[PDB]
Amino acid sequence: KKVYTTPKKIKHKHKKVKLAVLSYYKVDAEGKVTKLRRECSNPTCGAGVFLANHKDRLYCGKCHSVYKVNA
Amino acid sequence: QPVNDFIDTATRHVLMRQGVLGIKVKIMRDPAKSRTGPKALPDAVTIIEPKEEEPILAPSVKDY
RNA sequence: ACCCACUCGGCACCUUACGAGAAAUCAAAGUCUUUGGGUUCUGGGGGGAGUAUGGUCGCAAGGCUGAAACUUAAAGGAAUUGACGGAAGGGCACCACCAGGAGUGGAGCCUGCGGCUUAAUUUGACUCAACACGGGGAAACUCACCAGGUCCAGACACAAUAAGGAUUGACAGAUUGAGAGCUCUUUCUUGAUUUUGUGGGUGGUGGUGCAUGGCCGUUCUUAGUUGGUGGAGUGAUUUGUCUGCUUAAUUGCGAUAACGAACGAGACCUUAACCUACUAAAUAGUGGUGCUAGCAUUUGCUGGUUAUCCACUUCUUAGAGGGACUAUCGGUUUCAAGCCGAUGGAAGUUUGAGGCAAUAACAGGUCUGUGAUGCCCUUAGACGUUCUGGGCCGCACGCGCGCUACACUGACGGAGCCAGCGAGUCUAACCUUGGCCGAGAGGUCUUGGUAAUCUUGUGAAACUCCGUCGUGCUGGGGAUAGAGCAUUGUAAUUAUUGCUCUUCAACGAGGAAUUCCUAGUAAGCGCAAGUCAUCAGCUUGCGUUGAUUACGUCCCUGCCCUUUGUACACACC
Ligand SMILES: [Mg+2]
Ligand SMILES: [Mg+2]
Ligand SMILES: [Mg+2]
Ligand SMILES: [Mg+2]
Ligand SMILES: [Mg+2]
Ligand SMILES: [Mg+2]
Ligand SMILES: [Mg+2]
Ligand SMILES: [Mg+2]
Ligand SMILES: [Mg+2]
Ligand SMILES: [Mg+2]
Ligand SMILES: [Mg+2]
Ligand SMILES: [Mg+2]
Ligand SMILES: [Mg+2]
Ligand SMILES: [Mg+2]
Ligand SMILES: [Mg+2]
Ligand SMILES: [Mg+2]
Ligand SMILES: [Mg+2]
Ligand SMILES: [Mg+2]
Ligand SMILES: [Mg+2]
Ligand SMILES: [Mg+2]
Ligand SMILES: [Mg+2]
Ligand SMILES: [Mg+2]
Ligand SMILES: [Mg+2]
Ligand SMILES: [Mg+2]
Ligand SMILES: [Mg+2]
Ligand SMILES: [Mg+2]
Ligand SMILES: [Mg+2]
Ligand SMILES: [Mg+2]
Ligand SMILES: [Zn+2]
């Protein structure tokens, strides 16, 4: 054959970030709990799933991709 | 033609540690018992063997 | 001198085999385990070696005598069967010549093989037995090559990570060829399905056909293999199987220590041919009439009518059979097997053509047909696979198959108008008539057909006819090239194909050379089929037109078979 040349440049993939998850919420004066991060407005998602906040961008992730409801 | 008629034939790749050998097996089913086919090689020729006779015996004649 | 009987002593030829022997053979190589007439000499595995040494001889070169160390399993003899021959003698054949046909070889051009060129120009294959071969006509697929981009489809088991989250996925952005979350920005989403390591699996058109199966090509257009009882030989083994004759033929006849069989050739099987005899049919068709056209009219002719009824099976179709057995006759030959001509027959070259095809062989090709396969290799920065694009087509030349021509037995323009084997659309876009529109290509509205029912009668081509050309590269020729129009197709630039106008090459019958073939064949001609979305200068079968020359031989050539030699038997690589 010829085995191996390469301009170098070897790549990875990703990590599934890491991060300890969902404090995001806020239960205050006993034991009243509100919700910080609003939740998706499509049936497929059982209002247990919420909208990340970029700039402009608020989108649904239970939607693997689909649909942006912004605010 | 006889071929098509009187010989079963197989092959089998018997596969093994070392390699495979073909098995190849040929049978002649007796054209005697051919049931519905041609009941012997086309090759055959049987005569029928006559009959000894005590012939002559000048005319005479029977009547019923 | 001869002739002859017989006789001693010579050189020998022969027939035999009482007898010998390992056998070839030997009348001595006989009278030898049933071992003894007399006598001389030599040898005791193969090397080392007739070497060294000593003695001797001879001018000399050399002679005579003549060891050992070490080494080593054979070396050796006769004969058997193979293999092999740059030994001889017979054959066979259009893959070989003869007599001739039609060519390629000369040109343009279509393919393939080389070489060169490229990032890549993927690869197998090299005499017949590699080079239109891999069913190999590659735009993406294919795809093997090259530039790049994704994805696990990493069984399974054990280990660790881990419900505080092992893992998945992504909208927009950047990024990229890409509306690939490949990555990165951002931060939700998922929830024991993976993921990280090992052990072990897994794919692979990676290597190995020189590890294999299977298949396949060649040897072979050949005629060969073999066992019974009997003859020979201690056995290997032979004889049968063979001078000749004949045959496509170990076909026979015949010869004969053999007889009498078998596998293979044959027989057989398929397909072309022959039926006024058989059984049949609106998916075949012929006759008669009805229904009706047009001509002539005395009657006649020539058409329309997928069922208005009658009848039949010469055409067609295919089930069942009949027919040829070189019959007849005359020739000629071991009057044998055969062969020759003639009558006759549908047919008398194995009737024509194929299908099938014994033993044994080749390091023949085929791990690129396979989820046939051993071993090697690789296995996530993949030789797995997939998506993007180029490449297999690259252009100084070499080679092989072809296509088209070189024109007047013609090219063109009308016109006559004649086949066969094939093939076609259900979970769908096949073959397609007819009706339009378009010069062409095609476009379009319909329709029949799962097909002996419809395209189709495949009104094909060669060709037959009345002209237009006028021998001049000319109205032969159609290379190359520009311009447009269409058509398959997600996609046509490197131009898939098609059509139109213009352009108008070489080539004037081809050196040395080499193929193919004996009758419905050669060669001319087109069509169907494969491949197929699109693309035949390809091939497989089809029919149409349809010839001059053999019905010989062995000169070449290839290959058999017999004798022979042999020190090869992994068999002349
Ligand atoms: Mg003897
Ligand atoms: Mg020495
Ligand atoms: Mg010999
Ligand atoms: Mg002859
Ligand atoms: Mg000649
Ligand atoms: Mg010639
Ligand atoms: Mg090779
Ligand atoms: Mg590609
Ligand atoms: Mg693993
Ligand atoms: Mg494979
Ligand atoms: Mg081989
Ligand atoms: Mg093989
Ligand atoms: Mg021939
Ligand atoms: Mg004996
Ligand atoms: Mg013999
Ligand atoms: Mg008939
Ligand atoms: Mg006659
Ligand atoms: Mg080889
Ligand atoms: Mg194979
Ligand atoms: Mg491993
Ligand atoms: Mg190629
Ligand atoms: Mg060829
Ligand atoms: Mg004409
Ligand atoms: Mg127009
Ligand atoms: Mg001209
Ligand atoms: Mg022309
Ligand atoms: Mg075709
Ligand atoms: Mg081809
Ligand atoms: Zn949602």
Short mmCIF file of C-alpha atoms (C1' of nucleotides) in Angstrom, two decimals, chain C residues 87-407:
data_model
loop_
_atom_site.label_atom_id
_atom_site.label_comp_id
_atom_site.label_asym_id
_atom_site.label_seq_id
_atom_site.Cartn_x
_atom_site.Cartn_y
_atom_site.Cartn_z
"C1'" A C 87 16.54 -40.96 -32.43
"C1'" A C 88 13.74 -43.49 -36.62
"C1'" G C 89 9.25 -45.35 -38.92
"C1'" G C 90 4.27 -45.00 -39.58
"C1'" G C 91 -0.56 -41.51 -39.26
"C1'" C C 92 -4.48 -37.66 -38.42
"C1'" A C 93 -6.71 -32.41 -39.61
"C1'" C C 94 -9.14 -26.01 -43.16
"C1'" C C 95 -7.44 -24.47 -35.24
"C1'" A C 96 -2.48 -27.78 -41.48
"C1'" C C 97 -1.14 -27.20 -46.19
"C1'" C C 98 -3.55 -28.17 -51.67
"C1'" A C 99 -7.03 -25.89 -55.16
"C1'" G C 100 -9.62 -21.16 -54.39
"C1'" G C 101 -12.92 -18.08 -51.66
"C1'" A C 102 -13.60 -13.92 -48.23
"C1'" G C 103 -10.07 -10.96 -45.08
"C1'" U C 104 -7.05 -8.59 -41.45
"C1'" G C 105 -1.68 -6.74 -42.18
"C1'" G C 106 -1.59 -0.68 -45.70
"C1'" A C 107 -5.66 4.22 -44.11
"C1'" G C 108 -9.46 6.98 -40.79
"C1'" C C 109 -11.98 5.59 -36.75
"C1'" C C 110 -14.26 2.06 -32.37
"C1'" U C 111 -12.42 -1.00 -28.43
"C1'" G C 112 -8.69 -3.81 -25.70
"C1'" C C 113 -3.36 -4.87 -24.18
"C1'" G C 114 1.90 -1.93 -23.36
"C1'" G C 115 4.36 2.04 -22.46
"C1'" C C 116 4.36 6.78 -21.07
"C1'" U C 117 1.67 10.59 -18.27
"C1'" U C 118 -1.01 11.71 -13.90
"C1'" A C 119 -2.71 13.13 -6.83
"C1'" A C 120 -5.25 8.74 -9.19
"C1'" U C 121 -4.57 7.13 -14.22
"C1'" U C 122 -7.84 0.23 -9.20
"C1'" U C 123 -6.91 -4.45 -10.47
"C1'" G C 124 -6.71 -10.18 -12.96
"C1'" A C 125 -4.67 -12.10 -17.11
"C1'" C C 126 0.92 -12.74 -21.64
"C1'" U C 127 2.12 -18.57 -27.05
"C1'" C C 128 -1.85 -21.57 -29.30
"C1'" A C 129 -4.47 -22.12 -23.75
"C1'" A C 130 -3.36 -13.47 -22.25
"C1'" C C 131 -4.98 -8.39 -25.71
"C1'" A C 132 -14.82 -6.68 -27.52
"C1'" C C 133 -11.59 -11.79 -21.91
"C1'" G C 134 -13.33 -11.08 -16.01
"C1'" G C 135 -20.10 -11.53 -19.10
"C1'" G C 136 -15.37 -5.31 -17.93
"C1'" G C 137 -20.82 -0.97 -23.18
"C1'" A C 138 -17.34 2.71 -15.52
"C1'" A C 139 -21.04 10.16 -15.78
"C1'" A C 140 -22.95 9.45 -9.44
"C1'" C C 141 -23.52 4.01 -7.87
"C1'" U C 142 -20.27 0.30 -9.84
"C1'" C C 143 -15.26 0.89 -7.14
"C1'" A C 144 -11.33 -1.89 -6.16
"C1'" C C 145 -7.96 3.98 -7.56
"C1'" C C 146 -6.77 9.46 -5.77
"C1'" A C 147 -8.31 14.46 -2.70
"C1'" G C 148 -11.09 15.13 1.28
"C1'" G C 149 -15.82 14.69 5.00
"C1'" U C 150 -19.13 11.32 8.38
"C1'" C C 151 -20.51 6.38 11.04
"C1'" C C 152 -20.26 1.79 14.09
"C1'" A C 153 -23.63 -1.68 12.08
"C1'" G C 154 -16.89 -2.59 17.99
"C1'" A C 155 -21.20 -10.10 19.56
"C1'" C C 156 -20.05 -11.00 24.09
"C1'" A C 157 -17.69 -11.45 29.00
"C1'" C C 158 -15.06 -9.12 32.94
"C1'" A C 159 -13.43 -4.59 34.89
"C1'" A C 160 -14.25 0.96 36.07
"C1'" U C 161 -17.09 5.56 35.57
"C1'" A C 162 -22.20 6.42 37.27
"C1'" A C 163 -28.54 8.07 39.73
"C1'" G C 164 -25.43 13.82 42.81
"C1'" G C 165 -25.75 11.16 36.56
"C1'" A C 166 -22.92 6.10 32.73
"C1'" U C 167 -24.88 8.08 27.83
"C1'" U C 168 -27.93 10.42 23.53
"C1'" G C 169 -29.27 14.45 20.57
"C1'" A C 170 -29.48 19.58 18.93
"C1'" C C 171 -32.10 24.53 17.22
"C1'" A C 172 -28.57 29.56 15.76
"C1'" G C 173 -23.91 30.85 15.29
"C1'" A C 174 -19.06 29.87 13.93
"C1'" U C 175 -17.12 26.04 10.97
"C1'" U C 176 -17.54 22.97 5.93
"C1'" G C 177 -18.45 21.48 -0.55
"C1'" A C 178 -22.77 20.75 2.02
"C1'" G C 179 -29.74 22.49 5.61
"C1'" A C 180 -23.09 16.81 8.74
"C1'" G C 181 -24.04 19.51 15.77
"C1'" C C 182 -17.64 16.66 11.98
"C1'" U C 183 -15.93 19.95 15.45
"C1'" C C 184 -16.37 24.79 18.49
"C1'" U C 185 -19.60 29.02 20.70
"C1'" U C 186 -24.20 28.79 24.09
"C1'" U C 187 -27.17 25.13 27.34
"C1'" C C 188 -30.95 22.43 27.32
"C1'" U C 189 -32.38 17.65 25.93
"C1'" U C 190 -32.23 12.71 26.99
"C1'" G C 191 -31.78 8.50 31.44
"C1'" A C 192 -28.49 2.54 32.26
"C1'" U C 193 -30.08 1.65 25.83
"C1'" U C 194 -23.81 3.60 25.88
"C1'" U C 195 -19.06 4.78 27.27
"C1'" U C 196 -13.50 4.07 29.15
"C1'" G C 197 -9.96 -0.72 29.48
"C1'" U C 198 -9.13 -5.83 28.57
"C1'" G C 199 -9.92 -10.48 26.95
"C1'" G C 200 -12.76 -11.80 22.46
"C1'" G C 201 -15.53 -11.17 18.58
"C1'" U C 202 -16.57 -8.65 13.93
"C1'" G C 203 -16.47 -6.83 8.65
"C1'" G C 204 -12.98 -6.20 4.49
"C1'" U C 205 -13.02 -6.30 -3.99
"C1'" G C 206 -6.48 -6.36 1.73
"C1'" G C 207 -2.14 -10.89 0.35
"C1'" U C 208 -1.97 -15.78 -0.75
"C1'" G C 209 -5.32 -19.76 -6.76
"C1'" C C 210 1.99 -21.32 -4.72
"C1'" A C 211 -2.41 -23.32 1.24
"C1'" U C 212 -8.05 -24.72 -0.30
"C1'" G C 213 -13.38 -26.12 -2.13
"C1'" G C 214 -16.21 -25.19 -6.12
"C1'" C C 215 -16.31 -24.13 -10.86
"C1'" C C 216 -13.60 -23.60 -15.20
"C1'" G C 217 -9.79 -23.61 -19.76
"C1'" U C 218 -6.43 -26.76 -22.05
"C1'" U C 219 -4.35 -31.78 -23.27
"C1'" C C 220 -8.88 -33.70 -26.71
"C1'" U C 221 -11.36 -31.39 -33.90
"C1'" U C 222 -8.25 -37.12 -29.05
"C1'" A C 223 -9.27 -42.11 -28.89
"C1'" G C 224 -8.35 -43.89 -24.89
"C1'" U C 225 -9.19 -46.98 -19.40
"C1'" U C 226 -10.24 -51.88 -17.68
"C1'" G C 227 -11.74 -56.90 -15.01
"C1'" G C 228 -13.19 -62.20 -15.63
"C1'" U C 229 -11.11 -67.56 -16.99
"C1'" G C 230 -6.73 -69.16 -20.09
"C1'" G C 231 -1.03 -68.54 -22.25
"C1'" A C 232 4.08 -66.22 -20.48
"C1'" G C 233 7.23 -64.28 -16.44
"C1'" U C 234 10.14 -65.89 -9.30
"C1'" G C 235 8.15 -61.01 -9.15
"C1'" A C 236 7.48 -55.87 -11.33
"C1'" U C 237 4.43 -57.09 -15.18
"C1'" U C 238 2.55 -58.94 -20.10
"C1'" U C 239 -0.74 -61.39 -23.27
"C1'" G C 240 -5.99 -60.12 -24.56
"C1'" U C 241 -5.15 -54.06 -26.32
"C1'" C C 242 -2.01 -56.84 -32.77
"C1'" U C 243 1.82 -56.35 -39.27
"C1'" G C 244 -2.36 -55.17 -42.25
"C1'" C C 245 -6.90 -53.71 -43.83
"C1'" U C 246 -10.91 -50.26 -42.58
"C1'" U C 247 -13.28 -46.28 -39.40
"C1'" A C 248 -14.95 -39.97 -36.83
"C1'" A C 249 -13.52 -43.76 -33.64
"C1'" U C 250 -9.33 -49.83 -29.04
"C1'" U C 251 -15.06 -48.19 -35.44
"C1'" G C 252 -14.74 -52.65 -37.13
"C1'" C C 253 -13.23 -56.95 -40.21
"C1'" G C 254 -9.11 -59.76 -40.06
"C1'" A C 255 -4.79 -61.67 -37.78
"C1'" U C 256 -4.22 -64.79 -33.46
"C1'" A C 257 -2.43 -67.84 -26.97
"C1'" A C 258 -5.94 -66.13 -25.96
"C1'" C C 259 -11.42 -66.26 -25.16
"C1'" G C 260 -15.31 -63.72 -23.96
"C1'" A C 261 -17.27 -58.39 -21.40
"C1'" A C 262 -17.42 -53.72 -19.52
"C1'" C C 263 -16.48 -47.86 -18.65
"C1'" G C 264 -15.38 -44.17 -22.78
"C1'" A C 265 -16.91 -43.62 -28.94
"C1'" G C 266 -21.53 -45.65 -30.18
"C1'" A C 267 -26.29 -46.16 -28.34
"C1'" C C 268 -28.80 -42.31 -26.03
"C1'" C C 269 -30.93 -36.76 -25.59
"C1'" U C 270 -32.29 -31.92 -28.01
"C1'" U C 271 -33.15 -29.34 -32.42
"C1'" A C 272 -33.84 -28.84 -37.76
"C1'" A C 273 -36.04 -31.61 -41.78
"C1'" C C 274 -40.78 -35.81 -44.08
"C1'" C C 275 -47.17 -37.28 -43.34
"C1'" U C 276 -53.83 -35.37 -48.24
"C1'" A C 277 -52.89 -41.23 -42.09
"C1'" C C 278 -54.43 -40.08 -35.76
"C1'" U C 279 -56.42 -36.94 -31.67
"C1'" A C 280 -57.98 -31.31 -31.82
"C1'" A C 281 -58.88 -25.38 -31.76
"C1'" A C 282 -62.28 -17.48 -32.33
"C1'" U C 283 -55.21 -17.00 -29.05
"C1'" A C 284 -54.27 -20.88 -36.14
"C1'" G C 285 -56.38 -21.00 -40.61
"C1'" U C 286 -58.77 -22.56 -45.42
"C1'" G C 287 -63.46 -23.31 -48.01
"C1'" G C 288 -69.22 -21.64 -48.73
"C1'" U C 289 -72.80 -18.10 -47.51
"C1'" G C 290 -74.94 -14.52 -45.28
"C1'" C C 291 -73.74 -8.29 -44.55
"C1'" U C 292 -71.47 -5.03 -47.68
"C1'" A C 293 -67.36 -1.88 -51.42
"C1'" G C 294 -65.37 -1.15 -56.45
"C1'" C C 295 -64.70 -2.55 -61.19
"C1'" A C 296 -66.82 -5.30 -65.24
"C1'" U C 297 -71.18 -6.51 -66.22
"C1'" U C 298 -73.48 -13.31 -69.05
"C1'" U C 299 -71.56 -15.57 -65.67
"C1'" G C 300 -66.25 -12.86 -63.53
"C1'" C C 301 -62.39 -10.44 -60.76
"C1'" U C 302 -60.23 -7.56 -56.46
"C1'" G C 303 -60.88 -5.85 -51.41
"C1'" G C 304 -64.12 -4.54 -46.05
"C1'" U C 305 -67.14 -7.63 -42.22
"C1'" U C 306 -62.20 -10.97 -33.98
"C1'" A C 307 -68.46 -14.36 -33.96
"C1'" U C 308 -74.46 -13.25 -38.65
"C1'" C C 309 -74.51 -19.00 -38.92
"C1'" C C 310 -72.21 -24.02 -41.95
"C1'" A C 311 -67.98 -27.29 -42.74
"C1'" C C 312 -63.23 -29.00 -42.80
"C1'" U C 313 -57.70 -29.67 -40.25
"C1'" U C 314 -53.90 -29.23 -46.91
"C1'" C C 315 -51.25 -24.06 -44.19
"C1'" U C 316 -50.21 -23.35 -38.46
"C1'" U C 317 -49.94 -25.15 -33.83
"C1'" A C 318 -48.09 -30.29 -30.51
"C1'" G C 319 -49.62 -34.49 -28.01
"C1'" A C 320 -49.14 -40.16 -30.48
"C1'" G C 321 -46.93 -42.50 -33.76
"C1'" G C 322 -44.90 -44.04 -38.91
"C1'" G C 323 -40.24 -43.21 -41.69
"C1'" A C 324 -33.50 -44.61 -43.07
"C1'" C C 325 -31.29 -49.82 -41.69
"C1'" U C 326 -25.92 -45.99 -46.29
"C1'" A C 327 -32.36 -49.60 -48.69
"C1'" U C 328 -31.86 -51.11 -54.21
"C1'" C C 329 -28.67 -52.37 -57.83
"C1'" G C 330 -23.89 -52.43 -60.10
"C1'" G C 331 -19.21 -51.97 -59.06
"C1'" U C 332 -14.53 -52.73 -56.65
"C1'" U C 333 -11.45 -54.68 -51.82
"C1'" U C 334 -7.93 -60.23 -47.94
"C1'" C C 335 -15.39 -60.05 -52.73
"C1'" A C 336 -13.70 -59.70 -45.53
"C1'" A C 337 -15.20 -54.97 -42.41
"C1'" G C 338 -15.61 -51.24 -45.69
"C1'" C C 339 -15.55 -48.14 -49.76
"C1'" C C 340 -17.35 -46.28 -54.95
"C1'" G C 341 -21.39 -44.69 -58.28
"C1'" A C 342 -26.02 -45.31 -59.77
"C1'" U C 343 -32.00 -45.73 -58.83
"C1'" G C 344 -35.03 -44.56 -55.20
"C1'" G C 345 -36.49 -41.84 -51.27
"C1'" A C 346 -38.32 -35.74 -46.89
"C1'" A C 347 -33.87 -37.15 -45.81
"C1'" G C 348 -28.30 -41.80 -47.40
"C1'" U C 349 -21.06 -36.02 -45.24
"C1'" U C 350 -22.13 -39.79 -37.81
"C1'" U C 351 -28.38 -37.57 -42.49
"C1'" G C 352 -27.39 -31.76 -40.87
"C1'" A C 353 -26.39 -29.27 -36.24
"C1'" G C 354 -25.62 -29.45 -31.39
"C1'" G C 355 -26.38 -31.39 -25.74
"C1'" C C 356 -24.09 -35.18 -22.72
"C1'" A C 357 -18.57 -37.47 -22.41
"C1'" A C 358 -14.35 -42.53 -19.34
"C1'" U C 359 -8.95 -42.49 -16.88
"C1'" A C 360 -5.24 -39.28 -16.01
"C1'" A C 361 -2.78 -35.10 -15.97
"C1'" C C 362 -1.59 -28.41 -15.51
"C1'" A C 363 1.40 -25.55 -9.26
"C1'" G C 364 -3.57 -23.24 -16.30
"C1'" G C 365 -6.98 -19.01 -14.60
"C1'" U C 366 -10.54 -17.91 -10.74
"C1'" C C 367 -9.66 -15.93 -2.22
"C1'" U C 368 -12.60 -9.37 -7.33
"C1'" G C 369 -19.61 -14.51 -8.09
"C1'" U C 370 -20.51 -16.08 -3.23
"C1'" G C 371 -22.63 -15.42 4.00
"C1'" A C 372 -17.35 -21.47 -0.17
"C1'" U C 373 -12.63 -21.27 2.76
"C1'" G C 374 -7.16 -22.22 5.93
"C1'" C C 375 -3.54 -19.25 7.06
"C1'" C C 376 -1.47 -14.03 7.03
"C1'" C C 377 -2.89 -9.06 7.08
"C1'" U C 378 -6.11 -4.92 8.91
"C1'" U C 379 -9.82 -3.69 12.62
"C1'" A C 380 -11.61 3.27 14.79
"C1'" G C 381 -6.27 8.73 12.61
"C1'" A C 382 -10.56 1.54 9.56
"C1'" C C 383 -7.66 -1.80 3.92
"C1'" G C 384 -14.98 -1.80 7.81
"C1'" U C 385 -18.64 1.68 5.40
"C1'" U C 386 -20.50 5.77 3.88
"C1'" C C 387 -21.30 11.04 1.78
"C1'" U C 388 -18.52 14.95 -1.55
"C1'" G C 389 -15.67 15.42 -6.33
"C1'" G C 390 -11.89 13.42 -10.13
"C1'" G C 391 -10.04 8.84 -12.00
"C1'" C C 392 -10.32 4.60 -14.67
"C1'" C C 393 -11.48 7.58 -21.10
"C1'" G C 394 -5.40 10.47 -19.18
"C1'" C C 395 -1.31 11.15 -25.06
"C1'" A C 396 5.33 11.22 -28.24
"C1'" C C 397 4.54 5.89 -29.78
"C1'" G C 398 4.18 -0.32 -29.71
"C1'" C C 399 0.55 -4.46 -29.95
"C1'" G C 400 -4.57 -7.35 -30.91
"C1'" C C 401 -10.28 -7.60 -32.12
"C1'" G C 402 -13.03 -4.65 -35.09
"C1'" C C 403 -16.03 -0.42 -37.93
"C1'" U C 404 -16.08 2.26 -42.13
"C1'" A C 405 -13.95 3.19 -47.06
"C1'" C C 406 -11.17 3.30 -51.12
"C1'" A C 407 -16.78 3.68 -55.32
#
